[PDB]
C-alpha cells in the first residue's frame, strides 16, 4: 500500500500506511520545538518533552505507565529545534489504547504543580547526561552564537531556569503551539480510517494556527569555552539555505563531497576531501531549518593540531569554492547522499519520522523516488555555489578544549 495524506480541514495532516506489520507505530508531529520560546520561558520545551508520562485528563500517570508497559508498548518523545514528535508503538491488538494514551498526552494534559516540581530534578539529570559528550555542548554553543533569537534557543534547559518553570508556562506553551493546523498524525501498520476517528475524538479540540514564531536572525560571533580537555572540538559554520530550496540539496551534496561520516569501521574515510586535506576527526555540519540553515566544518583534533586541522579544512572548502572539483567526486557524493537517505527511511521509526516531517513541512509526501531525481538535479556548479556561500558568509565559531593554539575568526 501507500501513505494516504489527508489534510483534514483542521490542518491536521492525517497520514496512514497499512503494510500488515506485526508491530505498528503511530506518531504525532507538532511544530512546537525550542525555537518558539523567548527569553521569558526558556527550557519549557525540555520539561514538556520530559513531561510525557504525567497525569492527563482521561488517564493518570500510573495508568499511562502501567498500561503502556502492560502490553509492552513504547512511548517516546523526539525533539528538534522546530518539531516535537510523540511516538507510540506496539502490537496491533493494543494500539487502540495506545492511541488513547498518546492522544490524551498530546491533547489534554493537566500539568499538576507537584508533578513538575518532581520533574525538575530529572530535567537536571537529563541535561547532565546529554552534555556528557563534547559534540552536544559544542553544537548548542554553535547555535547560540550563530543565531540571535529563534534557533539560538537551546534544546536543553538552562541552569538558572531549573526551579523556575511553572505549570502556567507549560499550559501557555501547549495552548499556543499544540493546535490542529500544526499537527500531523502518522500511522504505519494501521488503517487510515481509525486515525481519522481518533483525529476527531481528539486533535480536533485545539484549532487555530497557534502562536506564530519570530523569524530567526543570524548574528555570528564566536564562543570559545576553555574546558581543559586535550581534544579541541571546533565548529565553524555560516548561514546556508533553508528547508524547501534546491540550494539545500546543493548543500547536502556539498557535505557528502566534503565528508559526512565514515563508511568503513576504522577507515580513514579516504575520499573526504577534508580528511584527505590533512589523530583527528574532520567532517561537515549541515543542518537546515525552515527559515535558515547552517553549513560548515566541524573538527575534533588534538589541541596542538587544531591550527592545521581547522585551517587545512578551511582551505579545502576554499578549493571547492574555486571550482577545484571533479565530476566523479560529485557523482560519488550524490550516491552517498541517496544511499544515506534510503538507509534512513529503511527502518520503521525513521520512515514514520520522515513522513511526519514531510507532513509538517510541506503537507505532502514525497516518494523516495521523487527525491532521488531531485538530488540528481543538483549539479556540480550548484555545489560550488553553496560552497562560496559558506566561504563568504559571516562565520560563527564554537570552540572547546585547550584553546591556546586554536585560531580566531579574524585569523581563520
Amino acid at each position: 500500500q501507500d501513505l494516504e495524506f489527508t489534510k483534514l480541514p483542521n490542518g491536521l495532516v492525517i497520514a496512514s500506511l497499512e503494510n500488515y506489520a506485526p508491530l505498528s507505530r503511530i506518531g504525532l508531529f507538532v511544530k512546537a520545538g525550542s525555537r518558539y520560546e523567548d527569553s521569558n520561558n526558556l527550557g519549557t520545551s525540555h520539561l514538556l518533552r520530559l513531561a510525557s508520562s504525567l497525569t492527563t485528563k482521561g488517564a493518570s500517570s500510573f495508568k499511562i505507565t502501567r498500561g503502556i508497559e502492560a502490553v509492552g508498548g513504547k512511548l517516546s518523545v523526539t525533539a528538534t529545534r522546530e518539531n516535537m514528535a510523540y511516538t507510540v508503538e506496539g502490537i496491533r491488538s493494543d494500539i487502540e489504547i495506545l492511541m488513547e494514551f498518546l492522544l490524551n498526552v498530546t491533547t489534554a494534559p493537566e500539568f499538576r504543580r507537584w508533578e513538575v516540581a518532581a520533574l525538575r530534578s530529572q530535567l537536571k539529570i537529563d541535561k547532565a547526561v546529554a552534555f556528557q559528550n563534547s559534540q552536544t555542548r559544542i553544537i548548542e554553543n554553535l547555535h547560540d552564537v550563530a543565531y540571535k533569537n529563534a534557533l539560538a534557543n537551546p534544546l536543553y534547559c538552562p541552569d538558572y531556569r531549573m526551579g523556575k518553570i511553572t505549570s502556567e508556562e507549560l499550559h501557555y506553551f501547549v495552548q499556543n503551539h499544540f493546535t490542529s493546523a500544526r499537527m500531523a498524525l502518522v500511522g504505519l501498520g494501521v488503517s487510515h480510517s481509525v486515525l481519522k476517528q481518533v483525529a476527531e475524538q481528539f486533535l480536533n479540540m485545539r484549532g487555530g494556527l497557534g502562536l506564530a514564531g519570530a523569524k530567526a536572525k543570524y548574528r555570528g560571533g564566536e564562543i570559545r569555552e576553555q574546558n581543559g580537555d586535550n581534544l579541541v572540538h571546533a565548529a565553524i559554520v555560516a548561514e546556508s539555505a533553508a528547508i524547501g530550496n534546491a540550494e539545500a540539496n546543493a548543500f547536502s551534496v556539498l557535505q557528502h563531497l566534503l565528508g559526512a561520516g565514515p563508511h568503513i569501521k576504522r577507515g580513514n574515510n579516504t575520499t573526504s576531501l577534508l580528511s584527505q586535506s590533512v589523530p583527528f576527526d574532520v567532517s561537515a555540519f549541515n543542518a537546515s531549518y525552515s527559515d535558515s540553515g547552517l553549513f560548515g566544518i566541524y573538527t575534533i583534533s588534538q589541541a596542538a593540531a587544531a591550527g592545521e586541522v581547522i585551517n587545512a579544512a578551511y582551505n579545502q572548502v576554499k578549493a571547492v569554492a574555486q571550482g577545484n572539483l571533479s565530476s566523479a567526486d560529485v557523482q560519488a557524493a550524490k550516491n552517498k547522499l541517496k544511499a544515506g537517505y534510503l538507509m534512513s527511511v529503511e527502518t520503521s521509526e525513521g520512515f514514520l519520522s520522515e513522513i511526519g516531517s514531510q507532513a509538517l513541512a510541506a503537507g505532502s509526501y514525497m516518494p523516495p523516488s521523487t527525491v532521488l531525481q531531485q538530488i540528481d538535479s543538483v549539479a556540480d556548479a550548484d555545489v560550488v555555489k553553496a560552497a562560496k556561500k559558506f566561504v563568504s558568509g559571516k562565520k560563527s565559531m564554537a570552540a572547546s578544549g585547550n584553546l591556546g593554539h586554536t585560531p580566531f575568526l579574524d585569523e581563520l
Binding site: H46, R49, L50, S52, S53, T65, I68, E69, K74, L75, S76, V77, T78, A79, T80, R81, I125, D126, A128, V129, A130, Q132, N133, Q135, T136, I138, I139, E140, L155, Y156, A235, Q255, A260, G261, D281, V282, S283, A284, F285, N286, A287, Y289, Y298, I300
Partner: peptide
C-alpha cells in the same frame, strides 16, 4: 554531578530523545 549513570562527529543537528523506556540521549 555523577552524571547519573556515566559511561564521533557532529554532522546533523542535535535531537533530544526521552520517554517511558529507560534510555534517553541526543544524536546529531
Amino acid at each position: 554531578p555523577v552524571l547519573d549513570v556515566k559511561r564521533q562527529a557532529a554532522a546533523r543537528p542535535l535531537v533530544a530523545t526521552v520517554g517511558l523506556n529507560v534510555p534517553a540521549s541526543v544524536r546529531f
